[PDB]
Design a protein around this ligand. Structure first.
Ligand code: HEM
Ligand code: HEM
Ligand SMILES: C[C@H](O)[C@H](O)[C@H]1CNc2nc(N)[nH]c(=O)c2N1
Ligand SMILES: C[C@H](O)[C@H](O)[C@H]1CNc2nc(N)[nH]c(=O)c2N1
Ligand SMILES: CCCNC(=[NH2+])NCCC[C@H](N)C(=O)O
Ligand SMILES: CCCNC(=[NH2+])NCCC[C@H](N)C(=O)O
Ligand SMILES: [Zn+2]
Lengths: 409, 407
């Protein structure tokens, strides 16, 4: 079955066949679309998942059906029946990690998928060990501002009782503290985690931009706290090109975005601790982190300084202030020489990547709801692009926050 | 099953049961989501009619009454005899209002119950259609104080006597292909603008020429008509700060009025059912004015603002976008023509959603279409999870007539 996708701004039509290889469910039914919903083993099911993966791997290197291909399948089968699981070769791990990124339908930066530094941390055994691995990842990825995509992969899940987990949602993130008056100091998004850190012993400096400590869980044991070496945490003071009063807002952000709470599934194997990092698209900070009502919420303060007509929404003061803030984020990062991409460039690149993928791969799963930027949506090419969302493995998946499932010792 | 929807900004959770009454398909499957795709017999009729009549009588608190039963029997006998049936005026009004209520892509449904319905089922000719349409335009325009309305022409019979309004909207600007290879006016109407010429219209070759109505009655060939200029309310666009804006020479019409859709009620199909409301600022300022395939005016406006268009990261397109939309709203409001900004419209929709969920058990909504084309996340709907599904009565898309008409 072939599926057509049209770009209503260029009339360019593409054909998707890749979806024929999607195995997982999407959440939608022939009677209801849950496209905007944020989030809708056993010896038996493992080998098939292993085989599917290995066939994909060997096909990619043009060795499908080869003796090397058949021995690997036999080797893995034996291993699974013998140990109930199996270990991936280094090459398969790298291939797996890259494709999980390549298959992430909500990622607009996938044009960079083939360029990913994979750090094999499967020999790690303790939380201190995890900390060392993570520091090395942050330093390598940061590269003094010239950001490089990378991922660190800790030991896969076994009985589900010895999981490795990074309790932080991002390796680097600011603390949030709820005040008794109901207000919040810092980043609202991280209040609950900040509370856990404090409870675990963290001495919170209680400021507006406190880099959180790492809470690391190794081999199913209780998590431990670690402070990332300040010299390893690159930050950018936010100022505006024309508004000299902007800097006085006291804003800044970290340069390295590093998601650390997702699960990496490769050939049936589950890697519960797999922090990965890339670089920021300006709107993530400028629009969401700074202007979401439930985040820093700086629109008013910025608006006032600009002396905009805040009496009636129709003046579009919120929109005006929104643009200036995003100009400030991009300007500051560029001036400090810290990698970043604006939404115009990022979306234009995604379209080229997406078209390339259709011709070489026969498809490119994409989540329109997530691909389209949170500002100036229709002036970016993705808004006008029809997309097809479906799930391919390997892949990155969500998993419940560890504090909701961890059995304390 | 009972599905839940959460707003990630207020944490409010709503439970949806209304979806369990969905009938048509969505185009999606367990393996693939097509949420962003623009467009994914007597034995057949009575079931549909029954479904409709049941909801109608239920809405008037007479479910299972004799009147309910009698009506169901009358229609049943009418279908078996005439292979179709006619709706009572009350059922027609209820149907139209509910087709609007069920339009998952409409952000202004909080206004659903306030719809003036004009019964034009007694119409027989294109001239009659013109008369009905002018009356509709005049009533809805209300000198700038816009009022929602729909005019319903005769329902489809054998498919060979369908009434159709060939225009996509009652009021729209023409588009012509020039020698340069460029396009003059609105590129979106190039094809229609040609069929008008190919039919007789004498195009003024302007940047904003109000297109002539092309009306089709009883399957006959469409006829042209010029909407009395005095009935077409237009707004010149100026900025409340950049006095150079007026020089762009831009203007837009105040009455948005979709005319190419199909209204389906109790199985019956109304191929010509033009309806109107009022504009949300972004529709004109973001989409019609800035879309690359439309008037595509960003660069021009950018220049006059003298901003660095050298690098995309200066966000000149974004800065220029806001101002263009500030102007549209400013103009309309100055001329006292009804119009709503995306902030206000989305806030209303959220309220409507909450009302619908507690009174109806849900509200089908298409997130992709509900979220404005600019400043998406600073509007509440962005943070609102939505469930999309099809309910009848409904407004459906239909093939352009020029691709199906047998001259
Ligand atoms: C080169 C820099 C990259 C850019 C500019 C980029 C940009 C983005 C953005 C803007 C999002 C949506 C984020 C949000 O709204 O919170 C996203 C999501 C995602 N990206 Fe990328 N990305 C990059 C690199 C990567 C890398 C290296 C990986 C994996 C190895 C990756 C995996 C994903 C995944 C799995 C998601 C969805 C996660 C979720 O659902 O929250 N991205 N990316
Ligand atoms: C009172 C003011 C109203 C507002 C502000 C409003 C606004 C909107 C907007 C912004 C859209 C999407 C427009 C686009 O992007 O092309 C829309 C779509 C829609 N509206 Fe409303 N609407 C209003 C009244 C009405 C009325 C009176 C009806 C029906 C009688 C209605 C039926 C629909 C339908 C069926 C769609 C989807 C059409 C499509 O698929 O292209 N709307 N509305
Ligand atoms: C409810 C809705 O799904 C939610 O607000 C989504 C919309 N699109 C998004 N897109 C991106 N990139 N990131 C997000 O967090 C979201 N949130
Ligand atoms: C491809 C994509 O479906 C298309 O560009 C949609 C997106 N959302 C939209 N939303 C509204 N209101 N109107 C539109 O025309 C569109 N176009
Ligand atoms: C970790 C891979 C890079 N992905 C990315 N750019 N963004 C996703 C996480 C960043 C998050 N939106 C934030 O503002 O903090
Ligand atoms: C016809 C009812 C009102 N519907 C509405 N506001 N918009 C839909 C059609 C208008 C179209 N988006 C435009 O900019 O021209
Ligand atoms: Zn779907």
């Amino acid at each position: 079955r072939f599926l057509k996708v049209k770009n209503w701004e260029t009339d360019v039509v593409l054909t998707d066949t890749l979806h024929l290889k999607s195995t997982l469910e999407t959440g939608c039914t022939e009677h209801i679309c849950m496209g905007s919903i944020m989030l809708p083993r056993t010896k038996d099911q493992l080998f098939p998942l292993a085989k599917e993966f290995l066939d994909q791997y060997y096909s990619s290197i043009k060795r499908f059906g080869s003796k090397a291909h058949m021995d690997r399948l036999e080797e893995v089968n034996k291993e699974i029946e013998s140990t109930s699981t199996y270990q991936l070769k280094d090459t398969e791990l790298i291939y797996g990690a890259k494709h999980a990124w390549r298959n992430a339908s909500r990622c607009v930066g996938r044009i960079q998928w083939s360029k990913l530094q994979v750090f094999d941390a499967r020999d790690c055994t303790t939380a201190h060990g995890m900390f060392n691995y993570i520091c090395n990842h942050v330093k390598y990825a940061t590269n003094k501002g010239n950001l490089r995509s990378a991922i660190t992969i800790f030991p896969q899940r076994t009985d589900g009782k010895h999981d490795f987990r990074v309790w932080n949602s991002q390796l680097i993130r600011y603390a949030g503290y709820k005040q008794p008056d109901g207000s919040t100091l810092g980043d609202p998004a991280n209040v609950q985690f900040t509370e856990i850190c404090i409870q675990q012993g963290w001495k919170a400096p209680r400021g507006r931009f406190d880099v959180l400590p790492l809470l690391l869980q190794a081999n199913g044991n209780d998590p431990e706290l670690f402070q990332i070496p300040p010299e390893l945490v690159l930050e950018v003071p936010i100022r505006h090109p024309k508004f000299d009063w902007f800097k006085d807002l006291g804003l800044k952000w970290y340069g390295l975005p590093a998601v650390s709470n997702m699960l990496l599934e490769i050939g049936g194997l589950e890697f519960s601790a797999c922090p990965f990092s890339g670089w920021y698209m300006g709107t993530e900070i400028g629009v969401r982190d700074y202007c979401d009502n439930s985040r820093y919420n700086i629109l008013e303060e910025v608006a006032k300084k600009m002396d905009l007509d805040m009496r009636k929404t129709s003046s579009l003061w919120k929109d005006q202030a929104l643009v200036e803030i995003n100009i400030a984020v991009l300007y500051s990062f560029q001036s400090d020489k810290v990698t970043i991409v604006d939404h115009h460039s990022a979306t234009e690149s995604f379209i080229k990547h997406m078209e390339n993928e259709y011709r070489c791969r026969g498809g490119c799963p994409a989540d329109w709801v997530w691909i389209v930027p949170p500002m100036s949506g229709s002036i970016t090419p993705v808004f006008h692009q029809e997309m097809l969302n479906y799930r391919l493995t390997p892949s990155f998946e969500y998993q419940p926050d560890p504090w909701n499932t961890h059995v304390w010792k």
